[PDB]
Short mmCIF file of all heavy atoms in Angstrom, two decimals:
data_model
loop_
_atom_site.label_atom_id
_atom_site.label_comp_id
_atom_site.label_asym_id
_atom_site.label_seq_id
_atom_site.Cartn_x
_atom_site.Cartn_y
_atom_site.Cartn_z
N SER A 1 0.58 -1.59 -12.23
CA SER A 1 0.20 -0.26 -12.66
C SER A 1 -1.29 -0.28 -12.97
O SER A 1 -1.87 -1.34 -13.23
CB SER A 1 1.00 0.20 -13.88
OG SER A 1 0.74 -0.63 -15.00
N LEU A 2 -1.91 0.90 -12.93
CA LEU A 2 -3.32 1.01 -13.26
C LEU A 2 -3.61 2.42 -13.75
O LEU A 2 -2.87 3.36 -13.48
CB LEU A 2 -4.21 0.65 -12.06
CG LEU A 2 -4.08 1.46 -10.77
CD1 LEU A 2 -5.08 2.62 -10.74
CD2 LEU A 2 -4.27 0.57 -9.55
N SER A 3 -4.72 2.54 -14.49
CA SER A 3 -5.18 3.83 -14.99
C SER A 3 -6.62 4.03 -14.54
O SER A 3 -7.46 3.14 -14.72
CB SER A 3 -5.09 3.89 -16.52
OG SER A 3 -5.07 5.24 -16.97
N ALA A 4 -6.89 5.18 -13.93
CA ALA A 4 -8.22 5.47 -13.41
C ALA A 4 -8.55 6.94 -13.63
O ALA A 4 -7.66 7.77 -13.83
CB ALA A 4 -8.34 5.11 -11.92
N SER A 5 -9.84 7.24 -13.60
CA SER A 5 -10.33 8.60 -13.80
C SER A 5 -10.54 9.29 -12.45
O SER A 5 -10.67 8.65 -11.41
CB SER A 5 -11.64 8.58 -14.59
OG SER A 5 -11.43 8.09 -15.90
N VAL A 6 -10.55 10.62 -12.50
CA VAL A 6 -10.81 11.41 -11.30
C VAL A 6 -12.16 11.03 -10.72
O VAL A 6 -13.17 10.94 -11.44
CB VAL A 6 -10.74 12.91 -11.63
CG1 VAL A 6 -11.27 13.74 -10.48
CG2 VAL A 6 -9.31 13.32 -11.96
N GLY A 7 -12.20 10.78 -9.41
CA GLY A 7 -13.41 10.38 -8.74
C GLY A 7 -13.60 8.89 -8.60
O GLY A 7 -14.48 8.46 -7.84
N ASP A 8 -12.82 8.08 -9.31
CA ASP A 8 -12.95 6.63 -9.21
C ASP A 8 -12.44 6.14 -7.86
O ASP A 8 -11.74 6.85 -7.12
CB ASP A 8 -12.17 5.94 -10.33
CG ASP A 8 -12.82 6.12 -11.69
OD1 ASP A 8 -13.92 6.71 -11.75
OD2 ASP A 8 -12.23 5.68 -12.70
N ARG A 9 -12.81 4.91 -7.52
CA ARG A 9 -12.29 4.22 -6.35
C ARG A 9 -11.17 3.29 -6.78
O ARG A 9 -11.37 2.45 -7.66
CB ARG A 9 -13.39 3.44 -5.62
CG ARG A 9 -12.86 2.60 -4.47
CD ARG A 9 -13.95 1.76 -3.84
NE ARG A 9 -14.92 2.56 -3.11
CZ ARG A 9 -14.93 2.71 -1.79
NH1 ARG A 9 -14.03 2.12 -1.02
NH2 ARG A 9 -15.87 3.47 -1.23
N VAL A 10 -10.01 3.44 -6.16
CA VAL A 10 -8.81 2.68 -6.52
C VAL A 10 -8.48 1.73 -5.38
O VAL A 10 -8.45 2.14 -4.21
CB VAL A 10 -7.63 3.61 -6.84
CG1 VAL A 10 -6.34 2.80 -6.98
CG2 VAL A 10 -7.91 4.40 -8.11
N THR A 11 -8.22 0.47 -5.71
CA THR A 11 -7.84 -0.55 -4.74
C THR A 11 -6.49 -1.14 -5.13
O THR A 11 -6.31 -1.58 -6.27
CB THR A 11 -8.90 -1.65 -4.66
OG1 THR A 11 -10.11 -1.10 -4.12
CG2 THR A 11 -8.43 -2.79 -3.78
N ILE A 12 -5.56 -1.15 -4.18
CA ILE A 12 -4.24 -1.75 -4.36
C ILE A 12 -4.05 -2.80 -3.27
O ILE A 12 -4.22 -2.51 -2.08
CB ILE A 12 -3.13 -0.69 -4.30
CG1 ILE A 12 -3.32 0.35 -5.40
CG2 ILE A 12 -1.76 -1.35 -4.41
CD1 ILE A 12 -2.38 1.53 -5.30
N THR A 13 -3.70 -4.02 -3.68
CA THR A 13 -3.53 -5.13 -2.77
C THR A 13 -2.05 -5.45 -2.59
O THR A 13 -1.22 -5.16 -3.46
CB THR A 13 -4.28 -6.37 -3.25
OG1 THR A 13 -3.79 -6.76 -4.54
CG2 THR A 13 -5.75 -6.07 -3.35
N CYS A 14 -1.73 -6.04 -1.44
CA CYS A 14 -0.36 -6.36 -1.08
C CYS A 14 -0.39 -7.67 -0.30
O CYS A 14 -1.07 -7.77 0.72
CB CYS A 14 0.26 -5.24 -0.24
SG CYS A 14 1.93 -5.53 0.38
N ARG A 15 0.36 -8.66 -0.78
CA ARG A 15 0.28 -10.03 -0.31
C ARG A 15 1.61 -10.42 0.31
O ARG A 15 2.65 -10.38 -0.36
CB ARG A 15 -0.08 -10.96 -1.47
CG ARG A 15 0.19 -12.42 -1.23
CD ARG A 15 0.08 -13.17 -2.55
NE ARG A 15 1.34 -13.20 -3.28
CZ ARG A 15 1.50 -13.74 -4.48
NH1 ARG A 15 0.48 -14.26 -5.14
NH2 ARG A 15 2.70 -13.74 -5.04
N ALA A 16 1.59 -10.80 1.59
CA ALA A 16 2.79 -11.09 2.35
C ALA A 16 3.09 -12.58 2.33
O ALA A 16 2.18 -13.41 2.43
CB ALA A 16 2.67 -10.59 3.79
N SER A 17 4.37 -12.93 2.21
CA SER A 17 4.77 -14.33 2.18
C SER A 17 4.69 -14.98 3.56
O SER A 17 4.64 -16.22 3.64
CB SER A 17 6.19 -14.46 1.63
OG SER A 17 7.13 -13.78 2.45
N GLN A 18 4.66 -14.19 4.63
CA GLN A 18 4.54 -14.70 5.98
C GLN A 18 3.70 -13.74 6.80
O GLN A 18 3.25 -12.70 6.31
CB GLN A 18 5.92 -14.90 6.63
CG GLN A 18 6.73 -16.05 6.06
CD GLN A 18 8.03 -16.28 6.81
OE1 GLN A 18 8.41 -15.47 7.67
NE2 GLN A 18 8.71 -17.37 6.50
N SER A 19 3.47 -14.09 8.06
CA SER A 19 2.75 -13.21 8.97
C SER A 19 3.64 -12.03 9.36
O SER A 19 4.83 -12.19 9.62
CB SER A 19 2.30 -13.97 10.22
OG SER A 19 1.54 -15.11 9.88
N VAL A 20 3.04 -10.84 9.41
CA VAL A 20 3.79 -9.66 9.81
C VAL A 20 3.84 -9.59 11.34
O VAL A 20 3.13 -10.29 12.05
CB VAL A 20 3.19 -8.38 9.21
CG1 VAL A 20 3.12 -8.50 7.69
CG2 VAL A 20 1.82 -8.10 9.78
N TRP A 21 4.71 -8.71 11.84
CA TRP A 21 4.91 -8.58 13.28
C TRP A 21 3.62 -8.16 13.96
O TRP A 21 3.05 -7.11 13.64
CB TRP A 21 6.02 -7.57 13.56
CG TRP A 21 6.32 -7.39 15.02
CD1 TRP A 21 6.12 -6.26 15.77
CD2 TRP A 21 6.88 -8.36 15.91
NE1 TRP A 21 6.52 -6.47 17.06
CE2 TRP A 21 6.99 -7.76 17.18
CE3 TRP A 21 7.30 -9.69 15.76
CZ2 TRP A 21 7.51 -8.43 18.29
CZ3 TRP A 21 7.81 -10.35 16.86
CH2 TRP A 21 7.91 -9.72 18.11
N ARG A 22 3.14 -9.00 14.88
CA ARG A 22 1.90 -8.79 15.62
C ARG A 22 0.68 -8.70 14.71
O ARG A 22 -0.36 -8.19 15.12
CB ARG A 22 1.98 -7.53 16.50
CG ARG A 22 3.10 -7.54 17.52
CD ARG A 22 3.15 -6.21 18.24
NE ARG A 22 3.25 -5.10 17.30
CZ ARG A 22 3.14 -3.83 17.63
NH1 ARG A 22 2.90 -3.45 18.87
NH2 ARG A 22 3.26 -2.90 16.68
N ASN A 23 0.80 -9.19 13.47
CA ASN A 23 -0.26 -9.08 12.47
C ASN A 23 -0.74 -7.64 12.32
O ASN A 23 -1.92 -7.39 12.08
CB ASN A 23 -1.43 -10.01 12.80
CG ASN A 23 -1.12 -11.47 12.53
OD1 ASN A 23 0.03 -11.89 12.57
ND2 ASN A 23 -2.16 -12.25 12.24
N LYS A 24 0.18 -6.68 12.46
CA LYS A 24 -0.19 -5.27 12.47
C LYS A 24 0.80 -4.34 11.78
O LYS A 24 0.38 -3.28 11.30
CB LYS A 24 -0.41 -4.78 13.90
CG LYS A 24 -1.82 -4.98 14.41
CD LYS A 24 -2.80 -4.26 13.51
CE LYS A 24 -4.23 -4.42 14.00
NZ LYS A 24 -5.20 -3.80 13.06
N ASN A 25 2.09 -4.66 11.72
CA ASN A 25 3.09 -3.72 11.22
C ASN A 25 3.12 -3.76 9.69
O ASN A 25 4.00 -4.35 9.06
CB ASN A 25 4.46 -4.03 11.81
CG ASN A 25 4.56 -3.66 13.28
OD1 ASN A 25 3.64 -3.92 14.06
ND2 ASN A 25 5.67 -3.04 13.66
N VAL A 26 2.14 -3.09 9.09
CA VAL A 26 2.09 -2.88 7.65
C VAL A 26 1.77 -1.41 7.40
O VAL A 26 0.80 -0.88 7.96
CB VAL A 26 1.05 -3.79 6.96
CG1 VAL A 26 0.81 -3.33 5.53
CG2 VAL A 26 1.51 -5.23 6.99
N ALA A 27 2.58 -0.77 6.57
CA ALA A 27 2.41 0.64 6.24
C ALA A 27 2.34 0.82 4.73
O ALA A 27 2.86 0.01 3.96
CB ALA A 27 3.56 1.48 6.82
N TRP A 28 1.67 1.90 4.32
CA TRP A 28 1.54 2.25 2.91
C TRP A 28 2.24 3.57 2.66
O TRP A 28 2.03 4.54 3.41
CB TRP A 28 0.07 2.33 2.49
CG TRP A 28 -0.62 1.00 2.46
CD1 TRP A 28 -1.37 0.44 3.45
CD2 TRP A 28 -0.63 0.06 1.37
NE1 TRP A 28 -1.84 -0.78 3.05
CE2 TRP A 28 -1.40 -1.04 1.78
CE3 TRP A 28 -0.05 0.05 0.09
CZ2 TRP A 28 -1.62 -2.14 0.96
CZ3 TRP A 28 -0.27 -1.05 -0.72
CH2 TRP A 28 -1.05 -2.13 -0.28
N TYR A 29 3.07 3.62 1.63
CA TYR A 29 3.81 4.82 1.27
C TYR A 29 3.39 5.32 -0.11
O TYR A 29 2.88 4.56 -0.94
CB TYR A 29 5.32 4.58 1.31
CG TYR A 29 5.94 4.78 2.67
CD1 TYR A 29 5.89 3.77 3.63
CD2 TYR A 29 6.56 5.97 3.01
CE1 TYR A 29 6.45 3.95 4.88
CE2 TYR A 29 7.12 6.16 4.26
CZ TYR A 29 7.07 5.15 5.19
OH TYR A 29 7.62 5.33 6.44
N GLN A 30 3.61 6.61 -0.33
CA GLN A 30 3.28 7.28 -1.58
C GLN A 30 4.49 8.08 -2.02
O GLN A 30 5.05 8.85 -1.24
CB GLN A 30 2.07 8.21 -1.40
CG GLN A 30 1.78 9.10 -2.60
CD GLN A 30 0.83 10.23 -2.28
OE1 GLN A 30 1.10 11.07 -1.42
NE2 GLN A 30 -0.31 10.26 -2.96
N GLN A 31 4.90 7.91 -3.28
CA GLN A 31 6.05 8.63 -3.82
C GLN A 31 5.64 9.34 -5.10
O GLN A 31 5.32 8.69 -6.10
CB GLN A 31 7.23 7.69 -4.07
CG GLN A 31 8.50 8.43 -4.47
CD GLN A 31 9.72 7.53 -4.53
OE1 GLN A 31 9.62 6.33 -4.76
NE2 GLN A 31 10.89 8.12 -4.31
N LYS A 32 5.66 10.66 -5.07
CA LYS A 32 5.40 11.52 -6.21
C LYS A 32 6.69 11.80 -6.97
O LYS A 32 7.79 11.60 -6.44
CB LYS A 32 4.76 12.83 -5.73
CG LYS A 32 3.46 12.61 -4.98
CD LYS A 32 2.74 13.91 -4.69
CE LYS A 32 1.40 13.63 -4.04
NZ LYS A 32 0.59 14.86 -3.86
N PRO A 33 6.60 12.25 -8.22
CA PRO A 33 7.81 12.43 -9.03
C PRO A 33 8.82 13.37 -8.39
O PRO A 33 8.49 14.49 -7.99
CB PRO A 33 7.28 13.00 -10.35
CG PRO A 33 5.88 12.50 -10.43
CD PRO A 33 5.38 12.46 -9.02
N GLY A 34 10.07 12.91 -8.30
CA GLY A 34 11.15 13.71 -7.75
C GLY A 34 11.07 13.95 -6.26
O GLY A 34 11.82 14.80 -5.75
N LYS A 35 10.21 13.25 -5.54
CA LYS A 35 10.03 13.45 -4.11
C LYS A 35 10.40 12.20 -3.33
O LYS A 35 10.54 11.11 -3.90
CB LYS A 35 8.58 13.84 -3.78
CG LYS A 35 8.11 15.12 -4.46
CD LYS A 35 8.81 16.35 -3.89
CE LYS A 35 8.36 17.62 -4.60
NZ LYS A 35 8.65 17.56 -6.06
N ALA A 36 10.57 12.37 -2.03
CA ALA A 36 10.82 11.26 -1.13
C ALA A 36 9.50 10.56 -0.80
O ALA A 36 8.43 11.16 -0.89
CB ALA A 36 11.49 11.75 0.14
#
């Protein structure tokens, strides 16, 4: 979790235990409250 102000730059990292398919199949998702 993190707390930031409007206008800040936010960085989120994700570390894989192995190589992904073709070193390319990585996606980022966003979930807002009560939404898919």
Side-chain angles (χ1 to χ4, degrees):
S1 63
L2 60 92
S3 201
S5 295
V6 169
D8 289 355
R9 175 184 290 259
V10 170
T11 294
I12 300 172
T13 60
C14 176
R15 163 193 88 184
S17 61
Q18 289 185 351
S19 305
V20 304
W21 181 246
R22 302 175 306 171
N23 286 27
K24 272 302 181 184
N25 288 43
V26 168
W28 290 95
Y29 274 82
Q30 172 195 60
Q31 187 171 27
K32 301 189 176 186
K35 300 291 178 300

